[PDB]
Amino acid sequence: HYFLMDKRWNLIHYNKTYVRDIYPFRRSVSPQLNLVHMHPEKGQELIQKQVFTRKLEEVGRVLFLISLTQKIPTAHKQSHVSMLQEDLLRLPSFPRSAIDAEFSLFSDPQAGKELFGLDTLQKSLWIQLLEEMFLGMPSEFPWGDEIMLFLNVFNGALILHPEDSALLRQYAATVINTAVHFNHLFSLSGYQWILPTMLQVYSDYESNPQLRRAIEFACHQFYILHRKPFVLQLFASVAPLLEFKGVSAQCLFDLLQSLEGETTDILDILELVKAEKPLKSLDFCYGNEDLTFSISEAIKLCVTVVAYAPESFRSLQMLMVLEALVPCYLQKMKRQTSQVETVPAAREEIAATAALATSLQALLYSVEVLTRPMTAPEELDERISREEFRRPRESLLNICTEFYKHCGPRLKILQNLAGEPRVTALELLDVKSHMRLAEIAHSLLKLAPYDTQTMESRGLRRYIMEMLPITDWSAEAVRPALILILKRLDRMFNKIHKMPTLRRQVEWEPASSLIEGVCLTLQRQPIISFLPHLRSLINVCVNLVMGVVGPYLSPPLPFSTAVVRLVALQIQALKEDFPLSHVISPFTNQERREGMLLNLLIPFVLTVGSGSKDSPWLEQPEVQLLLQTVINVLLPLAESTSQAAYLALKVILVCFERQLGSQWYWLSLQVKEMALRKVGGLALWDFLDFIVRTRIPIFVLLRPFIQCKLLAQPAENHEELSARQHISDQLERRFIPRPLCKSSLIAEFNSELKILKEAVHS
Amino acid sequence: FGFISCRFTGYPSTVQEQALLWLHVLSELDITVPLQLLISMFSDGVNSVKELANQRKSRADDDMNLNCFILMFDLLLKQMELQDDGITMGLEHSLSKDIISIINNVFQAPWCNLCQSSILCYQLACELLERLAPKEESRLVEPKFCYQQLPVTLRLIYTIFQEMAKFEEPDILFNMLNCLKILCLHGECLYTARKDHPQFLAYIQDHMLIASLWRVVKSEFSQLSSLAVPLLLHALSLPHGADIFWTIINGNFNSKDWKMRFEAVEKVAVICRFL
Amino acid sequence: PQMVKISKLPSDFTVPKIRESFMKQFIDRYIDQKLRKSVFSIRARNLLEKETA
C-alpha cells in the first residue's frame, strides 16, 4: 500500500530504480520524500505511467545524441567519437543504464507491453549509437577488456529481445560492422566477447527457426570475414558453454553444418552492413575460395590447437570441443550415407573416415607430453591440478574410443558394400596411436589409486572396457600397448593387495570395471592369454579375493565375480598351461580351505556350470580334482567348514551333473562313508534332504541306505529329529517335482552361499 | 493385431496408452503395421476418449489423454516412414482425410509439462500435415453453412483457428500457424472453399481468419509473424478479406486510446517487415 | 607472414594455415528429448531467466 513519493516534483518511485539516478545532485538540501499510503493498484498505475514517461525521455536522449553525432562534419568526427567513448567509460553507470530493464513492470497485463515496446526501441537505439561511435573511431584503436563494456550492451539487447527480428538483424548488422571495422581486434579476440552470447541465444531458442537462421547467417558472414581465427574463437567461446543453461553438443554441430552450406538472408542483414559489398576475407592470407567450412576442417583446427601446446588450458578446451564434435560428425555421416544410395556414398564415407583417422592419428602423435605421469605436486589447489591433469587424457581416450568403435564396424560394412575389393582395410589408429592411447591410460591409472575421481573417470573406463577388446592384439607390433596396460594393472592391484591397508580403501566398482575390461579383452581375443603379465594379474586378483593379511576387508560381490570370471576364462583358454589345480593348491591347507570354498570354489562352479544346460568349459580332470578337493574337505571338522563343504558338494553335483558321467557309484560310497562317520553332524541331514528333493543321480543309488538303513537308526536330538521326519515324509507319499531347468537350484545355491558368507564374518 | 485393436474400441487413455506403448516398441523394430488398421484403431481410440469425456460431463486424464495423442501422432509418423515411401498422398486422399479427421478430433479433444506436451502434440500434427501435403507452396495469391458435409480440411482449419484463439505461447502459435500454412497454402483448401463452399469461407473471413492473424502478429515474437503475414496476404486475396482488414486498420489507427494506436503501429510495421 | 608450423606430425596431416601471432595470442590467454526443445525455449523466454542473465 505504501509508496515512496515526491511531492515537490510529482514523482512516485519505482522500487528497482537507483536513488542517485533520479536525485543526482549533491546539494546541501537532501531530497524530501513521503511514505504515501495508496491503494496498490493506483500506486502501480502511477508507477507504470511515470516509468513509461521516463523511458521515453531516455529514448529521446539517445536519439538526440545520435542526431548530434550524425550532424558533426567529416572532420571533428574522430574527436567527437573519442569524447563519447571516454565519457561512457568514465560514466560509473553506463552499461547498467544502457542495459537494464523493468522486469517487475513487464509482467503487468496493463501498461506492461508498452514498456516492452519502448525497451525494444531503446535497445535498438543504443546499438545504433554504439555502432555510430565505433564507426568513426580509428580502425586500429588500441582496445583492451574495456571493449566488453561497450559490447555487453549489444549482448544485453540480445538477451531481452532475441526473437525480435528488427533487434536481431540490427544486432547482426552492427556486429558485422564492428568485425569489419575493428578487423585486427576481431581477428585475435573480440569474437570472444560476442560469440558466447550468440551461442547461448542460438541454443536457448532452438524452437525459433528464424532466430537460428539469422544467427547461422551471421556466423557464415563471420567465417567469410575471418575464416580460421573465427572458428578458433568460436570453439574457445563454446568450450565453457558445452555440457555433457548451457550450449548443447548438437546445436554446435548444427551451427557448423549451417556454416558449411550457403544460407539465404531472410531478414536482409547485409543491407544494413555499412561496408556492404560481396564480403571477402579481411586477411589477404585467407583470401581464397574457401567459402565452404567443412567439419573436417574444424576437427583439423582443434587437433592443431592441441598439437601446438598440448598442456595449455586452451588445449583442453579444444579437446572438449573435439569430444563434442566427433560423435555428431560420425552420426551425421552414417545418416547421410544411409539416406542415399550405397554405391556413390561408400567412397565418400570411406574417404571421410580415412581423413578423420589421419586427423586423429595426428592428434595422438602430436601429444606425447600427456603420456607423462603426474609429477608429484593447498589441498584444493592439488585437486584442481589433478583435475587439470586428468581432463585432457580422459578427453583423448573418449575421442579415440568413440571414433574407433563407430568406424570399425562401419568401415567393414562399407567395404562389404563398396562394390570393389580394391579398397584396402586401412588400419585406423595404427601401432603408434594404440601406444599413445595405452600410455595415456597408463598415466591415468598411475594417478588412479590415490584419486577416487580418477578411477571413476568415464574416459579411462571406456578405454579399458570398450577399446582394449576391440583392438586385434594379434600382430606383435600392437601387443606392447596391451602389455603396458596389463603391467600397470598388475602393479596397482599388487600394491592394493600389498602391506598398506589404506590403499584397500580404493572403491571396488572402478577396479571391477577394469577387471571386466580385461575379461572382455581376453574373451574377444584368447591369443593374449599367454602374456605373463596377464597371469601375474590373475594371480594377484585371486590373492585379493581370498582373505589374505598383508605380509581384512573382503572384496564385494562385483569384484569377486569379475575375478572369478577372469579365472574361468583363463582356464578355458589355457587348457593345461593354467590348471585349476594350480589355482586351488595354495589354499587346500587347513585354516584357509573355508575361504577357498566360500570365495573361489563355489563362485567358480556357479559361474562355470550355470548359464547353460551343458557346461563344456571345464574338462573332466578338473571336475575330478574339484570333487576330490571337496570330499577331502569332508572325509579326512568345523561346523562352518562342514556346511561350506556340503554346499560346495551340492553345487558341484548339480552344476557338473553331466560331466560326472560314470562316477556315481564312488560318489555314493563316499556319501555313505560321510553318513556313517557323521561328518556333518549338523546339516548332513540337510544335505540328504537336498538329495531327496532334487532326486539327483545319486538319489537312486542312496535310496536303499537312506530308507531301510538310515531311517532305522534312532534319532538323537529334536533338531535332527525334525530333519529326519522331513526326509522320511519326502521319501514316500511325496513326489513334489521341484526341479526346473536348474535355475531354481542355482538361485538356491547362490542364496545359501550369501547367507553362509554373511554368517561367517559375523 | 487383434489384441492391440481391441484396446482402443472403448477404453480410457490408461488402457490405450499401454497398447500405444507396446505398438511403439514394435515400430522401433521397423515392423510395418498396415496404415489402414492403424488409422482405424486410432480413430476408434480418439472416439472412445471423446465418448468417455462426454459421459463424464453428462453424469455431472488430461496429461494421460495428451500423452496418448502424442504417441498416436508419433506412431502414425513412424509407420508412414516404413509404408508410405516414395509418394506423398495429397490432402484429398482416402487415408489423408482419415488422418486429418484424427488430427481434428485430437485438437478438439479435452487434453509446465502440460505446455511442453501440448507443443509437442501440435508439432507432430504439423509433421503429419507436411507428410500429407504436396510439399510445395503454390501461388500465394491469384492476380448458415453446415459444419459437417465440409471437407475434413476445412473443419481442421476452423478448429485450428478456434484453438489458436485460446493460446498465447509462441511455440503453440507457431506450430498452429505452420499447420495452417500447410493447409491454407501448400494445398488449395481455402481456394476450394471459395470455389465450392462460399458461405463457409465468408464466415471464416468475417469471424476468425484475419482477426486471429492480426492478433498473432507481434514484434516480440516475429517468428509468429513470419507465418502470419503470408497467411494474411492469402486471406486478403480471398473474398471478404479486404473489408475485414479495412475495418481492423481503420478502427485501430483511429482509436482514441493511444495504447491501441501504439499497438497498431507495431502490428503494421511487423506486417510490412515480412511483405 | 609467419605461419604455424608443428613438428612430429604423421607426415599425412597438413597443418592449417594459421598465423603464428594468432596462435601465440590464443594460447597465452517418454519422448523427453522432443520436449527438451520446448522446455529450453520456454525457460529462455521466461522473464526470470532473462532477468538473471
Side-chain angles (χ1 to χ4, degrees), chain A residues 160 163 187-188 204-207 232 245 283 286 300 304 308 314 362 366, chain C residues 9 14 16-17 19-20 22 24-26 29 37 40-41 43-45 50:
Chain A
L160 299 182
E163 297 171 315
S187 177
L188 311 162
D204 279 333
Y205 300 90
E206 184 188 19
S207 66
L232 292 191
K245 193 179 183 179
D283 191 3
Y286 298 96
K300 291 185 60 178
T304 305
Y308 200 79
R314 198 78 71 177
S366 294
Chain C
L9 274 304
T14 160
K17 298 299 180 179
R19 324 193 69 169
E20 273 273 0
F22 177 82
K24 289 302 195 185
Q25 79 93 26
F26 197 60
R29 319 308 120 88
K37 193 181 198 179
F40 237 89
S41 192
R43 287 166 52 184
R45 290 196 197 92
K50 300 184 179 179

mmCIF file of all heavy atoms in Angstrom, chain A residues 160 163 187-188 204-207 232 245 283 286 300 304 308 314 362 366, chain C residues 9 14 16-17 19-20 22 24-26 29 37 40-41 43-45 50:
data_model
loop_
_atom_site.group_PDB
_atom_site.id
_atom_site.type_symbol
_atom_site.label_atom_id
_atom_site.label_comp_id
_atom_site.label_asym_id
_atom_site.label_seq_id
_atom_site.Cartn_x
_atom_site.Cartn_y
_atom_site.Cartn_z
ATOM 1 N N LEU A 160 17.350 -9.658 -23.893
ATOM 2 C CA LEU A 160 15.981 -9.235 -23.639
ATOM 3 C C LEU A 160 15.079 -9.513 -24.832
ATOM 4 O O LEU A 160 13.957 -10.005 -24.674
ATOM 5 C CB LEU A 160 15.958 -7.751 -23.287
ATOM 6 C CG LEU A 160 16.756 -7.398 -22.041
ATOM 7 C CD1 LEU A 160 16.642 -5.918 -21.734
ATOM 8 C CD2 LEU A 160 16.254 -8.228 -20.888
ATOM 9 N N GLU A 163 14.076 -12.712 -30.028
ATOM 10 C CA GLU A 163 13.128 -13.127 -31.051
ATOM 11 C C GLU A 163 12.577 -11.960 -31.855
ATOM 12 O O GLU A 163 11.879 -12.187 -32.848
ATOM 13 C CB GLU A 163 11.987 -13.909 -30.406
ATOM 14 C CG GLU A 163 12.445 -15.197 -29.748
ATOM 15 C CD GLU A 163 11.356 -15.851 -28.934
ATOM 16 O OE1 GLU A 163 10.665 -15.133 -28.184
ATOM 17 O OE2 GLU A 163 11.184 -17.082 -29.047
ATOM 18 N N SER A 187 40.140 -10.272 -35.229
ATOM 19 C CA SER A 187 40.905 -11.366 -35.805
ATOM 20 C C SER A 187 41.717 -12.130 -34.772
ATOM 21 O O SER A 187 42.324 -13.146 -35.117
ATOM 22 C CB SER A 187 41.845 -10.840 -36.891
ATOM 23 O OG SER A 187 42.648 -11.882 -37.408
ATOM 24 N N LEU A 188 41.754 -11.660 -33.526
ATOM 25 C CA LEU A 188 42.540 -12.289 -32.474
ATOM 26 C C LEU A 188 41.692 -12.460 -31.226
ATOM 27 O O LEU A 188 41.957 -13.326 -30.389
ATOM 28 C CB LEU A 188 43.770 -11.446 -32.149
ATOM 29 C CG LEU A 188 44.646 -10.953 -33.289
ATOM 30 C CD1 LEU A 188 45.504 -9.816 -32.793
ATOM 31 C CD2 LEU A 188 45.505 -12.083 -33.814
ATOM 32 N N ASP A 204 19.364 -21.628 -26.771
ATOM 33 C CA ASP A 204 18.146 -21.424 -25.998
ATOM 34 C C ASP A 204 16.914 -21.491 -26.886
ATOM 35 O O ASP A 204 15.964 -22.225 -26.596
ATOM 36 C CB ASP A 204 18.205 -20.079 -25.276
ATOM 37 C CG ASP A 204 19.016 -20.136 -24.002
ATOM 38 O OD1 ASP A 204 19.097 -21.223 -23.396
ATOM 39 O OD2 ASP A 204 19.566 -19.090 -23.602
ATOM 40 N N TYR A 205 16.915 -20.732 -27.975
ATOM 41 C CA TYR A 205 15.757 -20.651 -28.856
ATOM 42 C C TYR A 205 15.941 -21.605 -30.034
ATOM 43 O O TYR A 205 16.014 -21.214 -31.196
ATOM 44 C CB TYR A 205 15.541 -19.213 -29.310
ATOM 45 C CG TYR A 205 15.308 -18.269 -28.159
ATOM 46 C CD1 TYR A 205 16.366 -17.630 -27.539
ATOM 47 C CD2 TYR A 205 14.033 -18.032 -27.679
ATOM 48 C CE1 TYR A 205 16.163 -16.779 -26.484
ATOM 49 C CE2 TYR A 205 13.820 -17.176 -26.624
ATOM 50 C CZ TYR A 205 14.890 -16.554 -26.030
ATOM 51 O OH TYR A 205 14.686 -15.698 -24.977
ATOM 52 N N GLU A 206 16.015 -22.892 -29.693
ATOM 53 C CA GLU A 206 16.061 -23.923 -30.720
ATOM 54 C C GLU A 206 14.755 -23.988 -31.495
ATOM 55 O O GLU A 206 14.761 -24.270 -32.697
ATOM 56 C CB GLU A 206 16.368 -25.280 -30.092
ATOM 57 C CG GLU A 206 16.525 -26.400 -31.101
ATOM 58 C CD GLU A 206 16.644 -27.763 -30.452
ATOM 59 O OE1 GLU A 206 16.255 -27.898 -29.272
ATOM 60 O OE2 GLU A 206 17.127 -28.700 -31.122
ATOM 61 N N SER A 207 13.633 -23.732 -30.825
ATOM 62 C CA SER A 207 12.324 -23.796 -31.456
ATOM 63 C C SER A 207 12.067 -22.648 -32.418
ATOM 64 O O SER A 207 11.078 -22.695 -33.157
ATOM 65 C CB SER A 207 11.233 -23.813 -30.388
ATOM 66 O OG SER A 207 11.204 -22.582 -29.692
ATOM 67 N N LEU A 232 38.419 -20.743 -34.542
ATOM 68 C CA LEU A 232 39.120 -20.996 -33.290
ATOM 69 C C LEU A 232 38.496 -20.216 -32.142
ATOM 70 O O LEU A 232 38.340 -20.743 -31.035
ATOM 71 C CB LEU A 232 40.602 -20.666 -33.439
ATOM 72 C CG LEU A 232 41.344 -21.613 -34.378
ATOM 73 C CD1 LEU A 232 42.835 -21.408 -34.286
ATOM 74 C CD2 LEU A 232 40.987 -23.045 -34.053
ATOM 75 N N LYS A 245 21.030 -22.115 -19.509
ATOM 76 C CA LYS A 245 21.611 -23.386 -19.097
ATOM 77 C C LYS A 245 23.010 -23.549 -19.677
ATOM 78 O O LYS A 245 23.980 -23.018 -19.139
ATOM 79 C CB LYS A 245 20.717 -24.550 -19.529
ATOM 80 C CG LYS A 245 21.063 -25.882 -18.881
ATOM 81 C CD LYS A 245 20.124 -26.981 -19.348
ATOM 82 C CE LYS A 245 20.420 -28.296 -18.652
ATOM 83 N NZ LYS A 245 19.484 -29.372 -19.080
ATOM 84 N N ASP A 283 41.624 -10.732 -44.301
ATOM 85 C CA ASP A 283 43.047 -11.029 -44.349
ATOM 86 C C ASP A 283 43.384 -11.592 -45.721
ATOM 87 O O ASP A 283 42.714 -12.511 -46.200
ATOM 88 C CB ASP A 283 43.439 -12.023 -43.254
ATOM 89 C CG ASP A 283 44.940 -12.154 -43.095
ATOM 90 O OD1 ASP A 283 45.683 -11.434 -43.794
ATOM 91 O OD2 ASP A 283 45.381 -12.976 -42.265
ATOM 92 N N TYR A 286 44.145 -15.445 -45.944
ATOM 93 C CA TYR A 286 42.985 -16.316 -46.053
ATOM 94 C C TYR A 286 42.186 -16.074 -47.325
ATOM 95 O O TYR A 286 41.177 -16.753 -47.541
ATOM 96 C CB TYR A 286 42.081 -16.144 -44.829
ATOM 97 C CG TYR A 286 42.754 -16.519 -43.529
ATOM 98 C CD1 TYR A 286 43.339 -15.552 -42.725
ATOM 99 C CD2 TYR A 286 42.809 -17.839 -43.112
ATOM 100 C CE1 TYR A 286 43.959 -15.890 -41.539
ATOM 101 C CE2 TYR A 286 43.426 -18.188 -41.928
ATOM 102 C CZ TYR A 286 44.001 -17.209 -41.145
ATOM 103 O OH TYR A 286 44.616 -17.552 -39.963
ATOM 104 N N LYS A 300 40.430 -30.616 -37.804
ATOM 105 C CA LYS A 300 41.852 -30.362 -38.004
ATOM 106 C C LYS A 300 42.310 -29.144 -37.213
ATOM 107 O O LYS A 300 43.418 -29.131 -36.670
ATOM 108 C CB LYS A 300 42.153 -30.186 -39.488
ATOM 109 C CG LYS A 300 41.995 -31.457 -40.296
ATOM 110 C CD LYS A 300 42.431 -31.255 -41.730
ATOM 111 C CE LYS A 300 43.886 -30.839 -41.801
ATOM 112 N NZ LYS A 300 44.353 -30.691 -43.205
ATOM 113 N N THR A 304 45.102 -29.160 -34.339
ATOM 114 C CA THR A 304 46.268 -28.291 -34.447
ATOM 115 C C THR A 304 46.464 -27.452 -33.190
ATOM 116 O O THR A 304 47.598 -27.256 -32.742
ATOM 117 C CB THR A 304 46.126 -27.398 -35.672
ATOM 118 O OG1 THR A 304 45.901 -28.219 -36.820
ATOM 119 C CG2 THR A 304 47.377 -26.583 -35.888
ATOM 120 N N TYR A 308 49.828 -27.684 -30.944
ATOM 121 C CA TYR A 308 50.676 -26.525 -30.700
ATOM 122 C C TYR A 308 51.179 -26.503 -29.265
ATOM 123 O O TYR A 308 52.379 -26.336 -29.019
ATOM 124 C CB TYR A 308 49.900 -25.253 -31.017
ATOM 125 C CG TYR A 308 50.768 -24.056 -31.263
ATOM 126 C CD1 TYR A 308 51.394 -23.878 -32.482
ATOM 127 C CD2 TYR A 308 50.956 -23.100 -30.283
ATOM 128 C CE1 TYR A 308 52.188 -22.788 -32.717
ATOM 129 C CE2 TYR A 308 51.748 -22.007 -30.509
ATOM 130 C CZ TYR A 308 52.362 -21.855 -31.727
ATOM 131 O OH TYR A 308 53.157 -20.762 -31.968
ATOM 132 N N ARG A 314 43.778 -23.816 -23.197
ATOM 133 C CA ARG A 314 43.106 -23.784 -24.488
ATOM 134 C C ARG A 314 43.160 -25.137 -25.172
ATOM 135 O O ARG A 314 42.235 -25.502 -25.906
ATOM 136 C CB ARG A 314 43.743 -22.723 -25.373
ATOM 137 C CG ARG A 314 42.882 -22.314 -26.520
ATOM 138 C CD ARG A 314 41.804 -21.381 -26.047
ATOM 139 N NE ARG A 314 42.345 -20.078 -25.686
ATOM 140 C CZ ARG A 314 41.611 -19.048 -25.295
ATOM 141 N NH1 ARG A 314 40.298 -19.145 -25.169
ATOM 142 N NH2 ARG A 314 42.206 -17.893 -25.026
ATOM 143 N N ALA A 362 47.176 -37.799 -36.148
ATOM 144 C CA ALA A 362 47.965 -36.594 -35.927
ATOM 145 C C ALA A 362 47.794 -36.088 -34.506
ATOM 146 O O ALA A 362 48.764 -35.667 -33.866
ATOM 147 C CB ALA A 362 47.562 -35.514 -36.920
ATOM 148 N N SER A 366 50.982 -35.980 -31.991
ATOM 149 C CA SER A 366 51.399 -34.667 -31.534
ATOM 150 C C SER A 366 51.135 -34.445 -30.065
ATOM 151 O O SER A 366 51.220 -33.310 -29.591
ATOM 152 C CB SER A 366 50.703 -33.590 -32.361
ATOM 153 O OG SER A 366 51.140 -33.627 -33.706
ATOM 154 N N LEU C 9 54.327 -34.369 -36.723
ATOM 155 C CA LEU C 9 53.073 -34.781 -37.329
ATOM 156 C C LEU C 9 53.286 -36.060 -38.137
ATOM 157 O O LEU C 9 54.404 -36.352 -38.568
ATOM 158 C CB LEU C 9 52.523 -33.669 -38.219
ATOM 159 C CG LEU C 9 51.660 -32.594 -37.552
ATOM 160 C CD1 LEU C 9 50.484 -33.215 -36.829
ATOM 161 C CD2 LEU C 9 52.471 -31.752 -36.601
ATOM 162 N N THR C 14 48.464 -32.103 -42.847
ATOM 163 C CA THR C 14 48.944 -30.775 -43.198
ATOM 164 C C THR C 14 48.337 -29.763 -42.236
ATOM 165 O O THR C 14 47.112 -29.643 -42.144
ATOM 166 C CB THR C 14 48.589 -30.430 -44.643
ATOM 167 O OG1 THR C 14 48.643 -29.010 -44.822
ATOM 168 C CG2 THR C 14 47.196 -30.938 -44.993
ATOM 169 N N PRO C 16 46.765 -26.557 -40.784
ATOM 170 C CA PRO C 16 46.027 -25.495 -41.470
ATOM 171 C C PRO C 16 46.789 -24.181 -41.444
ATOM 172 O O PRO C 16 47.667 -23.952 -40.610
ATOM 173 C CB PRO C 16 44.723 -25.397 -40.671
ATOM 174 C CG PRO C 16 44.583 -26.721 -40.018
ATOM 175 C CD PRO C 16 45.975 -27.167 -39.706
ATOM 176 N N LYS C 17 46.448 -23.313 -42.389
ATOM 177 C CA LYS C 17 47.092 -22.009 -42.499
ATOM 178 C C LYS C 17 46.592 -21.128 -41.364
ATOM 179 O O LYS C 17 45.561 -20.463 -41.484
ATOM 180 C CB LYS C 17 46.804 -21.380 -43.855
ATOM 181 C CG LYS C 17 47.335 -22.180 -45.031
ATOM 182 C CD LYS C 17 48.846 -22.311 -44.969
ATOM 183 C CE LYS C 17 49.377 -23.104 -46.150
ATOM 184 N NZ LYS C 17 50.859 -23.218 -46.114
ATOM 185 N N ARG C 19 48.088 -18.163 -38.570
ATOM 186 C CA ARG C 19 49.205 -17.269 -38.328
ATOM 187 C C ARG C 19 49.789 -17.521 -36.946
ATOM 188 O O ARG C 19 49.066 -17.796 -35.986
ATOM 189 C CB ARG C 19 48.768 -15.813 -38.457
ATOM 190 C CG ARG C 19 47.731 -15.584 -39.534
ATOM 191 C CD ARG C 19 47.561 -14.110 -39.847
ATOM 192 N NE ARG C 19 48.734 -13.557 -40.509
ATOM 193 C CZ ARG C 19 48.776 -12.361 -41.083
ATOM 194 N NH1 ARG C 19 47.718 -11.568 -41.103
ATOM 195 N NH2 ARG C 19 49.906 -11.955 -41.653
ATOM 196 N N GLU C 20 51.117 -17.428 -36.856
ATOM 197 C CA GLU C 20 51.792 -17.655 -35.583
ATOM 198 C C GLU C 20 51.378 -16.635 -34.536
ATOM 199 O O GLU C 20 51.281 -16.969 -33.352
ATOM 200 C CB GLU C 20 53.302 -17.623 -35.779
ATOM 201 C CG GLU C 20 53.905 -18.955 -36.158
ATOM 202 C CD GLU C 20 54.244 -19.792 -34.948
ATOM 203 O OE1 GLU C 20 54.008 -19.320 -33.819
ATOM 204 O OE2 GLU C 20 54.751 -20.920 -35.126
ATOM 205 N N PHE C 22 48.438 -15.178 -34.151
ATOM 206 C CA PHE C 22 47.145 -15.557 -33.597
ATOM 207 C C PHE C 22 47.273 -16.755 -32.673
ATOM 208 O O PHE C 22 46.630 -16.807 -31.624
ATOM 209 C CB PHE C 22 46.140 -15.860 -34.701
ATOM 210 C CG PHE C 22 44.811 -16.316 -34.175
ATOM 211 C CD1 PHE C 22 43.878 -15.400 -33.743
ATOM 212 C CD2 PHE C 22 44.505 -17.654 -34.090
ATOM 213 C CE1 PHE C 22 42.664 -15.812 -33.250
ATOM 214 C CE2 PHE C 22 43.296 -18.062 -33.600
ATOM 215 C CZ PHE C 22 42.375 -17.140 -33.179
ATOM 216 N N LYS C 24 49.908 -17.716 -30.910
ATOM 217 C CA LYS C 24 50.549 -17.297 -29.670
ATOM 218 C C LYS C 24 49.574 -16.556 -28.770
ATOM 219 O O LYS C 24 49.458 -16.865 -27.577
ATOM 220 C CB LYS C 24 51.764 -16.425 -29.976
ATOM 221 C CG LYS C 24 52.932 -17.180 -30.583
ATOM 222 C CD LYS C 24 53.382 -18.309 -29.675
ATOM 223 C CE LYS C 24 54.744 -18.839 -30.082
ATOM 224 N NZ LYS C 24 55.144 -20.019 -29.266
ATOM 225 N N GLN C 25 48.845 -15.587 -29.324
ATOM 226 C CA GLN C 25 47.908 -14.833 -28.501
ATOM 227 C C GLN C 25 46.735 -15.703 -28.065
ATOM 228 O O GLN C 25 46.085 -15.415 -27.057
ATOM 229 C CB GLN C 25 47.427 -13.598 -29.258
ATOM 230 C CG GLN C 25 46.356 -13.863 -30.284
ATOM 231 C CD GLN C 25 44.969 -13.686 -29.723
ATOM 232 O OE1 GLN C 25 44.766 -12.934 -28.773
ATOM 233 N NE2 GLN C 25 44.005 -14.384 -30.299
ATOM 234 N N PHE C 26 46.446 -16.764 -28.816
ATOM 235 C CA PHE C 26 45.360 -17.670 -28.466
ATOM 236 C C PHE C 26 45.757 -18.565 -27.306
ATOM 237 O O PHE C 26 44.973 -18.792 -26.379
ATOM 238 C CB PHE C 26 44.998 -18.501 -29.696
ATOM 239 C CG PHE C 26 43.669 -19.182 -29.616
ATOM 240 C CD1 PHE C 26 42.511 -18.453 -29.460
ATOM 241 C CD2 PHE C 26 43.575 -20.552 -29.752
ATOM 242 C CE1 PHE C 26 41.292 -19.078 -29.404
ATOM 243 C CE2 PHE C 26 42.359 -21.179 -29.700
ATOM 244 C CZ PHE C 26 41.216 -20.442 -29.521
ATOM 245 N N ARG C 29 46.244 -16.636 -23.641
ATOM 246 C CA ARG C 29 45.039 -16.382 -22.859
ATOM 247 C C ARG C 29 44.397 -17.698 -22.422
ATOM 248 O O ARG C 29 44.325 -18.001 -21.233
ATOM 249 C CB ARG C 29 44.033 -15.549 -23.656
ATOM 250 C CG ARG C 29 44.642 -14.424 -24.469
ATOM 251 C CD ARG C 29 45.532 -13.533 -23.630
ATOM 252 N NE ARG C 29 46.899 -13.531 -24.134
ATOM 253 C CZ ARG C 29 47.349 -12.704 -25.066
ATOM 254 N NH1 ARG C 29 46.567 -11.790 -25.615
ATOM 255 N NH2 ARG C 29 48.618 -12.796 -25.457
ATOM 256 N N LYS C 37 13.250 -29.356 -26.440
ATOM 257 C CA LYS C 37 13.214 -28.141 -27.250
ATOM 258 C C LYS C 37 12.244 -27.119 -26.669
ATOM 259 O O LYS C 37 12.604 -25.953 -26.449
ATOM 260 C CB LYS C 37 12.818 -28.511 -28.680
ATOM 261 C CG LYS C 37 13.027 -27.446 -29.732
ATOM 262 C CD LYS C 37 12.570 -27.978 -31.083
ATOM 263 C CE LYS C 37 13.136 -27.174 -32.236
ATOM 264 N NZ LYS C 37 12.707 -27.726 -33.551
ATOM 265 N N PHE C 40 13.472 -25.818 -23.201
ATOM 266 C CA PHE C 40 14.540 -24.837 -23.347
ATOM 267 C C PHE C 40 13.992 -23.497 -23.812
ATOM 268 O O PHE C 40 14.354 -22.447 -23.266
ATOM 269 C CB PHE C 40 15.584 -25.354 -24.337
ATOM 270 C CG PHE C 40 16.974 -25.428 -23.777
ATOM 271 C CD1 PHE C 40 17.415 -26.574 -23.138
ATOM 272 C CD2 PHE C 40 17.844 -24.360 -23.905
ATOM 273 C CE1 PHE C 40 18.697 -26.649 -22.627
ATOM 274 C CE2 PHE C 40 19.126 -24.428 -23.396
ATOM 275 C CZ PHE C 40 19.553 -25.574 -22.757
ATOM 276 N N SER C 41 13.108 -23.512 -24.815
ATOM 277 C CA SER C 41 12.569 -22.254 -25.322
ATOM 278 C C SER C 41 11.735 -21.530 -24.272
ATOM 279 O O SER C 41 11.862 -20.307 -24.118
ATOM 280 C CB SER C 41 11.740 -22.511 -26.575
ATOM 281 O OG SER C 41 11.431 -21.294 -27.229
ATOM 282 N N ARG C 43 11.916 -21.824 -20.969
ATOM 283 C CA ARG C 43 12.817 -21.310 -19.945
ATOM 284 C C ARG C 43 13.517 -20.047 -20.420
ATOM 285 O O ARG C 43 13.625 -19.072 -19.671
ATOM 286 C CB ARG C 43 13.840 -22.377 -19.562
ATOM 287 C CG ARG C 43 13.277 -23.518 -18.737
ATOM 288 C CD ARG C 43 14.246 -24.687 -18.697
ATOM 289 N NE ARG C 43 15.583 -24.276 -18.286
ATOM 290 C CZ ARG C 43 16.635 -25.082 -18.245
ATOM 291 N NH1 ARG C 43 16.542 -26.357 -18.582
ATOM 292 N NH2 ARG C 43 17.810 -24.595 -17.857
ATOM 293 N N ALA C 44 13.983 -20.039 -21.669
ATOM 294 C CA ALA C 44 14.673 -18.864 -22.186
ATOM 295 C C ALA C 44 13.753 -17.651 -22.221
ATOM 296 O O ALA C 44 14.159 -16.547 -21.839
ATOM 297 C CB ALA C 44 15.230 -19.155 -23.576
ATOM 298 N N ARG C 45 12.508 -17.833 -22.670
ATOM 299 C CA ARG C 45 11.596 -16.699 -22.781
ATOM 300 C C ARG C 45 11.141 -16.173 -21.428
ATOM 301 O O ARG C 45 10.686 -15.029 -21.349
ATOM 302 C CB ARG C 45 10.366 -17.070 -23.607
ATOM 303 C CG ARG C 45 10.641 -17.271 -25.075
ATOM 304 C CD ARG C 45 9.356 -17.241 -25.879
ATOM 305 N NE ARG C 45 9.552 -17.816 -27.202
ATOM 306 C CZ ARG C 45 9.347 -19.091 -27.495
ATOM 307 N NH1 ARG C 45 8.898 -19.942 -26.589
ATOM 308 N NH2 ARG C 45 9.597 -19.522 -28.726
ATOM 309 N N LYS C 50 15.680 -14.209 -18.105
ATOM 310 C CA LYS C 50 16.281 -13.037 -18.730
ATOM 311 C C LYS C 50 16.790 -12.061 -17.680
ATOM 312 O O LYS C 50 17.858 -11.461 -17.846
ATOM 313 C CB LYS C 50 15.276 -12.359 -19.656
ATOM 314 C CG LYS C 50 14.789 -13.249 -20.778
ATOM 315 C CD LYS C 50 13.869 -12.499 -21.715
ATOM 316 C CE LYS C 50 13.398 -13.393 -22.842
ATOM 317 N NZ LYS C 50 12.465 -12.683 -23.753
#
